[PDB]
Design a protein around this nucleic acid. Sequence first.
DNA 1: CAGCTCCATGAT
DNA 2: GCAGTGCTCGCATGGAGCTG
DNA 3: GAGCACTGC
Length: 729
Amino acid sequence: FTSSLFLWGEALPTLLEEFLNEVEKMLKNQVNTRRIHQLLKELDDPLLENKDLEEKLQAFLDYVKEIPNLPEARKRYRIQKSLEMIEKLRSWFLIDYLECSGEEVDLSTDIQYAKGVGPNRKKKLKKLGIETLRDLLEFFPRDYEDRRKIFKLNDLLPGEKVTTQGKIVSVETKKFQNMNILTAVLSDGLVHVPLKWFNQDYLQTYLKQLTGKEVFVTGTVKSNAYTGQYEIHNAEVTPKEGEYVRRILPIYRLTSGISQKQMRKIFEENIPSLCCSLKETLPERILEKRKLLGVKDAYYGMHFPKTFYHLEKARERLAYEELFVLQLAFQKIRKEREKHGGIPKKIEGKLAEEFIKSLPFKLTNAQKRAHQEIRNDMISEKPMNRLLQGDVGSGKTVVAQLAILDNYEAGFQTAFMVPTSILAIQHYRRTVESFSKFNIHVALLIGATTPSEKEKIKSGLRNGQIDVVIGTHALIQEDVHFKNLGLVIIDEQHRFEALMNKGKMVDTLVMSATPIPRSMALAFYGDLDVTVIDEMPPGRKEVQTMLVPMDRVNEVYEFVRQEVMRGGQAFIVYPLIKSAVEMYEYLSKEVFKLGLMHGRLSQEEKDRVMLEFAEGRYDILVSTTVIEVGIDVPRANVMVIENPERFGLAQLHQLRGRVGRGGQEAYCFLVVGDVGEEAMERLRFFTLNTDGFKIAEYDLKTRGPGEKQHGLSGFKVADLYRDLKLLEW
DNA sequence: CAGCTCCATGAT
DNA sequence: GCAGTGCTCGCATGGAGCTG
DNA sequence: GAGCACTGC
Ligand SMILES: Nc1ncnc2c1ncn2[C@@H]1O[C@H](COP(=O)(O)OP(=O)(O)O)[C@@H](O)[C@H]1O
Ligand SMILES: [Mg+2]
């Protein structure tokens, strides 16, 4: 917990921003005259040395202090009057406004134009994916080491990079065996504090190059020098005046070759230059609305801020920007739908009331909602693009079927789409035996079907009472007709379009097995007016998920021999490292019923194979290619992911999903190797996560969206709304 | 199994 | 394009988690 | 000293 907790601690008092900060916290709650007066005592830092800033302030701190000796109203206008000025202040002072000129040059150079960079660095730098120069901005720091704050000498906190100050009087160098030692030492006045260097002599020069002045030293502390008194190693001792080395300064990815001090001076010398050249992107009317910097400065800020406030204002600008890009394209779609327009219709509680009472089980207040929502949106004078989202076995299917009656019941006909012929056939059965009948004629049209039959069908649709067609994105590729088509159901990712009747829009509905938390929903997809998400069905018991060490792997192996001997089946997934084949017939020392599926060898008659698994031809399987949310092998009691977490926390879900059906009270182990905490911190979490959305919650908070590549927004969301509003035009 | 990075140590 | 100043910044090794 | 800019031939 050490690091993750110490700098954190000694990080509140003593620097304008922190100050301003707190004061805002001050008001947003309650002053404390007393207090202020003690914050001001602790202030320290170069920013303050501005006249107004100082004058400007008094005025301020003076206005505030009055709060308390003030009844209710007397307090308000008082407050907002403030708050406004802080931000007012912050904007004035806290940012290093990049005042620009000379003139822009602007392309993708092969980076040698870069200054300081040269041949070998050329190659070095490209190990970081840095060609071009745009390449040299879109490349922001790992992190930031700050400094501004200077520690006193004799308060060195045992074991920590600090930056203290003082003279320096002592340049000794010591040689031993396979080691030297360079020392000079720093003298506040009273204290004197060893400051030691290892296999560097040069330093000798500089330090001597120096003896005289007082300076700023930046290093670490060490609990040794068993003679006592702490010893500071590794520092930097810059001559000084450092109003200008009492700054935040970045930390970039490195690459044997370069050094921070290197890489830095290299950003130090170009960024200001480049930044400057960037045609603004979003219009000035916006900017003004919400208040964070154009670009130049923003990009500026990500490298060389002087207020974490800066940096904040910089991501914030830099991130809204790129959500804009999305929500722009969205409406820009959503609108085009407003053109072509949609169609509604009336609806007979008849059907559903029937369907619903027909079933055995209950229904959920969830699916109920799925329902109230679909109807209504279909009904509405325009399109519907809902997303029926849920978690394998939540009741997605049912619901779809109501969509299917309601639409039929209305007047028009629906058209089910699905990635695979094998899946079509299979779905078909259900919608019918499901529809168990009433009075609806539903088809499939899959190319397997005999040419005539096709014909009898096609024609069936061109006119009349073929009520639903079940097929692949086969339909759309041949060019079918029917002059009423009131909806299109979809299952999932079909490889790699919308439908219009005469010219209006077709009620579109898309179901998915792999959840996605609302923000991500509303941010990469959003355009799917909604997602009526599911909260799950009863009687439903769930996978006893277990996590198992390796070695004991032959343990699980056996557990199957059983369950599988008692008539069940077992997946076995092994990522990438041929071994597979080696993993295979060494696994027919599990002699018994095995099948393979290399995977991305990806004919998507993968199901071809699963069918055959579900039918009972490969007692057990063998992965690679994380199997998908598809044809469902019933008997499959147990699952086995190995050397995981290479798998997102979701593919694993996928996998867990795939095994259970029945009640079957299925089971899924996961062999592990070594790895650790953060890794297993996660797994551990998986296993007890009854619920696959709090999964995504959790996949986000930890690894950024693995599911090209977002530069900037790690869930704060006021943006994703800041969007909707500004984000029409 | 390897190739790289990042971090912490190295001296009586 | 190579040859001569004059800058800035320069340890090395070993175990470490990470991705391929 | 490595790497690079910059100046000159
Ligand atoms: N309300 C319910 N209560 C109990 N079982 C239900 C309920 N709704 C659906 N089921 C059944 O439980 C399983 C749910 O999965 P399903 O409805 O096929 O959709 P999906 O797997 O896509 O979520 C099916 O057997 C379905 O028939
Ligand atoms: Mg389904």
